């Protein structure tokens, strides 16, 4: 049908590449509200356009607010594609017909807890600022933990009152003793809080920090107080350009209109003019899928299967994209977690013991992971084995299993006192050790060659 595609961009996106279907293509630079109202009222006199696809290059979130308001006052559906206009707002209104793209806070929180589970970081806390929308996050986390297979260890929630005086706020900041910390704050407060924590010394390698997409602002704007290795997830997928986004929006609109035509023919209706409703797409495009991609929405307007991306801060002070999001699952390009020991130039982190053992009946019991919860039972320990696939090729897979026995009891108690760290694994070369023409093998081949450190397994 009559659809208008308006783009407010600084990036050079030209226009020529952009029963009764007509499309409108325009390029806009300014973003002042009077210009928006004037353009909307001018195009509304242009041959009864029902479709409006908008994106923005700036990072101002009031544009989406004004777009939703004008859509409500004109009863015309509007989309958000990029920039502040595509930012997910708090609570839409049934009177409004404005819809967006990207996920809300709850979906991203679920993704974050999935990421935490996939690395077995079961001890954490909760740090929240006075930023609005924190109580919904708290309630969602409380509801999510109580119906989980993990049994997470949660410390008391840290809530800030004002710009921290470092008089009573530091009292709460000291009690944070976990390794994983969850922070929910704006970008301006993040620099202050992170500098405060770095002065408090809670900026160690094990003190991981996780924040939502809110605190990760401009890709170019990167404060120096963010340690190299901050955990962030934002829906900014750079492999998919805005052209695909607007094409998918056109597909959504065409499918919705085509499917709503048969139930009632006279659905597409736009208001006559700015100066001077029974059947619509308001409650109809809940279910929709184009070219396999399920582009369905929720009852509150959100997406069903968004595109979230896991990003971290490399040593080069850049947001490094790592993990994406599948239809429901979570993929990880880097299965083994990098240490990121160098957050800054004042952090000489050094402590870890490569331990290689061999399967011995009463000491090293190798058992498969429990499929019911996909987690090793608490009295076992993580491990891996480079298991070759075929005999023609040397390629193999690092299958992760669970180890127990009698000697493994010794290793656990040693870390309790000496307070060190280990990365347990199994020898694929073979038996304990045999000097084959002045060439060893197995554990001796892993300590003499210094590929490992110690071997808790039984040895003669």
């Amino acid at each position, epitope marked *: 049908l009559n659809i208008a595609v308006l783009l407010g961009h600084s990036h050079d996106v030209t226009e020529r590449e952009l029963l009764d279907v007509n499309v409108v293509a325009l390029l806009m630079n300014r973003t002042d509200p009077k210009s928006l109202i004037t353009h909307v009222c001018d195009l509304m006199s*242009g*041959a009864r356009i029902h479709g409006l696809v908008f994106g923005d290059d700036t990072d101002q979130e009031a544009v989406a607010q004004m777009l939703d308001f004008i859509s409500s006052q004109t009863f015309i559906p509007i989309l958000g594609i990029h920039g502040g206009a595509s930012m997910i707002m708090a609570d839409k209104d049934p009177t409004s017909t404005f819809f967006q793209f990207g996920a809300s806070i709850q979906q991203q929180a679920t993704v974050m807890l999935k990421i935490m589970q996939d690395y077995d970081w079961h001890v954490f806390s909760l740090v929240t600022t006075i930023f609005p929308g924190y109580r919904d996050f708290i309630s969602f986390i409380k509801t999510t933990v109580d119906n989980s297979f993990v049994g997470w260890d949660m410390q008391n929630v840290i809530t800030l009152d004002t710009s921290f005086e470092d008089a009573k706020t530091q009292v709460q900041l000291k009690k944070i003793h976990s390794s994983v910390i969850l922070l929910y704050c704006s970008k301006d407060e993040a620099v202050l809080i992170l500098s405060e924590a770095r002065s408090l010394g809670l900026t160690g390698y094990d003190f991981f920090w996780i924040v939502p997409s809110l605190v990760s602002g401009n890709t170019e704007l990167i404060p120096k107080e963010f340690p190299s290795g901050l955990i962030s997830v934002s829906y900014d997928d750079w492999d998919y350009s805005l052209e695909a986004r607007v094409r998918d929006g056109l597909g959504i609109l065409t499918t919705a209109a085509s499917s709503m035509l048969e139930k009632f*023919s*006279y659905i597409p209706e736009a208001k006559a003019s700015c100066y001077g409703p029974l059947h619509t797409l308001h409650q109809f495009m809940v279910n929709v899928t184009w070219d396999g991609k399920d582009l369905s929405f929720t009852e509150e307007g959100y997406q069903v299967h968004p595109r979230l991306v896991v990003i971290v801060l490399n040593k080069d002070r850049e947001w490094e994209k790592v993990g994406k999001w599948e239809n429901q699952t979570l993929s990880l390009r880097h299965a083994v977690w990098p240490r990121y020991k160098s957050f800054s130039d004042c952090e000489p982190d050094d402590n870890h013991l490569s331990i290689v053992t061999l399967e011995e009946a009463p000491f090293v019991i190798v058992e498969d992971i429990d499929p019911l919860t996909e987690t090793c039972v608490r009295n076992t320990v993580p491990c891996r084995k480079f298991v070759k696939i075929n005999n023609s090729t040397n390629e193999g897979m690092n299958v992760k299993k669970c180890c127990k026995g009698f000697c493994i009891d010794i290793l656990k108690k040693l870390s309790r006192t000496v307070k060190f760290t280990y990365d347990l694994y199994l020898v694929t070369n073979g038996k304990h050790g045999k000097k084959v023409n002045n060439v060893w093998n197995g554990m001796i081949g892993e300590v003499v060659y210094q590929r490992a450190v110690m071997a808790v397994g039984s040895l003669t």
Partner: antibody
Amino acid sequence: VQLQQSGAELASVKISCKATGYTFRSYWIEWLKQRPGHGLEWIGEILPGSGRTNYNEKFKGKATITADTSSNTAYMQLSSDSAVYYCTRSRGTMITREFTYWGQGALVTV
Amino acid sequence: IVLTQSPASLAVSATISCRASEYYGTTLMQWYQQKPGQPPKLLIYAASNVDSGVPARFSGSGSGTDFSLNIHPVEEDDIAMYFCQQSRKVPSTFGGGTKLE
């Protein structure tokens, strides 16, 4: 697609415009006045599917347009002017807003 | 929008002009041919594209508020009145008519 209308007239009157070539609930219907001595005018449009109606300021308050979804007919009532009348429909591709299908014409006189 | 065209009557054995008082690169002007006692027939749309099923002898051009129409070669068919219609703003309006002989 073909159109038919009422007969001649000679107070108030009503003129019918019946559709027998398409789905009558999808396209707008426009009324035109073609009083001899000049080109033409424009009165208003009506959508049978939803019933939304718009009128011209010059003819506002004098012409009332109504439609019946059952018999697929268009009714335009002038109250309390002798000119030839036409009811027409656009092609549907939109934007151009041109007139392609034309009626027969009802000649009213006082 | 108010339209005005000259001459009111034309004597040939030709061209037409229609001056107005564009929509993002698109011109909105149409020319209609109306024989006596017959409904109008659309001839040119978008001020540059002819209608399918019509003789190729017709061609038109124009932009802004000054547009013109010319015909060649001359035959018996172009013996009716003509007008120009705008669609940039509702309601539409037509021309003043132009005979031929």
